[PDB]
């Protein structure tokens, strides 16, 4: 049973899906489960009472949105099962789970219990013929067409700098933080309350994400922007009322570089990138500096790459050629790589078959990934 395999690229913020050997993921939607706050009085209302994807985006105000996955670690397993069922259902894929092999993705260095429980869901609840979990950085390099280079990424949950050199993903040199787009959105929400405009509701939380996506920019010199007084630019909400954003827009994405502002000890994106290069061998450092690939949604801030280049110039040894490259479609970089990896004839060897899982168990899944 070697049908066209499916590539479900997981993520805390957004979840991508579709078939192998494709240019773009056809099925992209945000990873959450909306449920109705209000009392459904009238007959002929929205049926089901568990909303995922575009229906939930259309009907935000009704639904109490909650995310199942934080920092690449699922909290609510029943919610992720409903999301995966919605992916396979007629509203999105129009396929059965029994036909196609599965390509899953996860952030590196996660708890193994969650990886085991993920496999249990795919093999038992769904009747998958073969499963395969993989890295995000390895796929992003397959999407670009390079083998050597570091992959800095920044989704909604995790930020991790994975160094790879000619098909050798060093498991030891992988740096990681639990600081990312969701924490930046939460930090921007806190700043908007300091400005004046309070947002506490779960449906109203996605307006803060929309403001973060649209009206934000990362300054090169933060001390210079602190001394100067801001212009206070405007933005229209979904309702109609205008909001002067003020200094919150530029101080919000500083969290990624300065993790002390939220109140939690971490390295930072720029430190993690330097740190992933340093932990590798001495001969391979200069090739890793030359090939730095960006990925994820939280790398799309204005003057983000320029700030990363300046931070590398400050920390790294002098007289070294720095190059932070990036693809055009930074959001769909990991999925394209999975679609390429799935289309290859080698893919049959790597996967965990259902028969092999039934015989061995979790140990076979731990062996095949690394």
């Amino acid at each position: 049973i070697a049908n066209q395999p499916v590539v479900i690229d997981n993520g805390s913020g957004v979840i991508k899906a579709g078939f192998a050997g494709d240019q773009i993921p056809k099925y992209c939607f945000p990873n959450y489960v909306g449920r109705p706050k209000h009392v459904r009085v009238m007959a002929g209302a929205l049926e089901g009472d568990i909303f995922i994807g575009p229906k939930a985006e259309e009907h935000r105000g009704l639904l109490s949105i909650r995310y199942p996955m934080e920092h690449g670690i699922v909290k609510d397993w029943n919610d992720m099962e409903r999301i995966w069922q919605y992916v396979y259902s007629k509203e999105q894929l129009q396929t059965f789970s029994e036909e196609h092999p599965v390509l899953l993705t996860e952030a590196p260095l996660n708890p193994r219990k969650n990886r085991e429980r993920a496999a249990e869901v795919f093999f038992e609840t769904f009747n998958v013929p073969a499963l395969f979990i993989s890295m995000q950085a390895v796929l992003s390099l397959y999407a670009t067409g390079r083998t050597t280079g570091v992959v800095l990424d920044s989704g909604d949950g995790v930020t991790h700098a994975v160094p790879i050199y000619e098909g050798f993903a060093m498991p030891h040199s992988i740096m990681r933080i639990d600081i990312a787009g969701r924490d930046v959105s939460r930090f921007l929400r806190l700043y908007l309350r300091k400005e004046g405009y309070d947002f506490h509701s779960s449906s109203e939380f996605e307006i803060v994400k929309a403001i973060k996506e649209r009206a934000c920019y990362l300054s090169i010199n933060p001390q210079k922007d602190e001394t100067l007084e801001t212009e206070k630019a405007q933005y229209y909400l979904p309702d109609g009322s205008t909001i002067e954003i003020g200094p919150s827009r530029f101080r919000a994405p500083e969290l990624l570089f300065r993790p002390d502002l939220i109140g939690e000890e971490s390295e930072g994106i720029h430190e993690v990138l330097v740190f992933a290069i340093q932990k590798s061998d001495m001969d391979l450092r200069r090739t890793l500096f030359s090939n730095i690939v960006l990925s994820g949604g939280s790398t799309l801030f204005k003057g983000f790459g320029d700030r990363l280049l300046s931070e590398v110039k400050k920390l790294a040894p002098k007289d070294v050629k720095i190059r932070i490259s990036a693809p055009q479609e930074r959001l769909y970089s990991t999925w394209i790589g999975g679609s390429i990896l799935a289309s290859l004839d080698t893919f049959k060897k790597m996967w965990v078959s259902k028969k092999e899982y039934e015989e061995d168990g979790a140990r076979s899944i731990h062996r095949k990934t690394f």
Binding site: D260, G263, E264, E265
Partner: protein, 91 residues
């Protein structure tokens, strides 16, 4: 007794120094069994050792090395120097 040693000397030194003393009681039976029994004792001990040596230190050293000096203060805010130079405590 089981001793590890690692030494890194770039930009300054770091050393790993270790040992585990083990006392065990085994019962002799066959040549095939005694050959595969002692090895089994070594295999499990040296793995448990490496496991602890790798997995405890990556996390527990990070927390015990942090219990001595923390990465950020008890407030989790970078200390304000202006605050330090114009504030009074006590009674």
């Amino acid at each position: 007794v089981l001793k590890i040693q690692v030494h890194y000397y770039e930009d300054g030194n770091v050393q790993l120094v270790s040992h585990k003393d083990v006392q065990d009681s085994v019962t002799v039976s066959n040549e095939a069994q005694t050959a595969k029994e002692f090895i089994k004792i070594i295999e499990h001990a040296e793995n448990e050792y490496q496991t602890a040596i790798s997995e405890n230190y990556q996390t527990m050293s990070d927390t015990t090395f942090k219990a001595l000096r923390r990465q950020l203060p008890v407030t989790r805010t970078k200390i304000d120097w202006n605050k330090i130079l114009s504030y009074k405590i006590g009674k």
